[PDB]
Amino acid sequence: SSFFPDFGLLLYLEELNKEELNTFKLFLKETMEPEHGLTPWNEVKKARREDLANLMKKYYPGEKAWSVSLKIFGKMNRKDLCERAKEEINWSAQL
């Protein structure tokens, strides 16, 4: 359902350790620029996880914030997260 934007993004950010979260922010900067410009980066680079999930949903509404994060997990080699997402999305659609 609507689980993934409402709850999913934050839950997955919580599976990132401190170093991985910094890697995530850099991938996010790289994907948001130059289209979104330089304004969001100031929010991003100081945001804790809950704050990061919220600000992503401003620029990437609904499932878009979730979709952007998943691609980043794959690029940063957190393939365990990509696999869990597959499992969850596939089960949910079967409901």
Numbering used by the authors: 7 to 101
Paper quotes:
Here, crystal structures of human NLRP14 pyrin-domain variants are reported. Structurally, NLRPs share a conserved tripartite domain architecture consisting of an N-terminal pyrin domain, a central NACHT domain (with reference to its initial identification in NAIP, CIITA, Het-E and TP1) and a C-terminal leucine-rich repeat (LRR) domain. Pyrin domains belong to the death-domain superfamily, which includes the CARDs, the death-effector domains (DEDs) and the death domains (DDs) in addition to the PYDs. The death-domain fold consists of six antiparallel α-helices packed around a highly conserved hydrophobic core with Greek-key topology.
NLRP14 PYD contains Leu at the central position 84, thereby breaking the charge bridge. To test the relevance of the proposed charge bridge to the pyrin-domain conformation, we introduced a L84R mutant to reconstitute the stabilizing charge bridge. The introduced positive charge of Arg84 bridges the negative charges of the opposing Glu26 and Asp86. This structure further confirms the proposed adaptive role of the hydrophobic residues Trp72, Leu76 and Leu87 that contribute to the hydrophobic core and thereby stabilize helix α6 within the bundle. With this crystal structure analysis we have identified a conformational regulation element (CRE) that allows us to predict the tendency of pyrin domains to adopt the closed or open conformation. Our previous structure-derived conclusions on the significance of the charge bridge/CRE suggested that the L84R mutant should adopt a stable six-helix bundle conformation. The L84R variant adopts a canonical death-domain fold with all six helices contributing to the stabilizing hydrophobic core. In quantitative terms, the hydrophobic core in the canonical six-helix bundle form (L84R) amounts to 2435 Å2, whereas the corresponding contact area will be reduced in the wild-type protein by approximately 490 Å2 to 1945 Å2, i.e. an approximate 20% reduction in the stabilizing interaction interface. By contrast, the L84R mutant crystallized in space group P21212 with one (monomeric) molecule per asymmetric unit. While the engineered L84R mutant showed remarkable properties such as a drastically improved thermal stability that correlates with a strictly monomeric six-α-helix structure, the naturally occurring D86V mutant behaved very much like the wild-type protein despite its severe physiological implications.
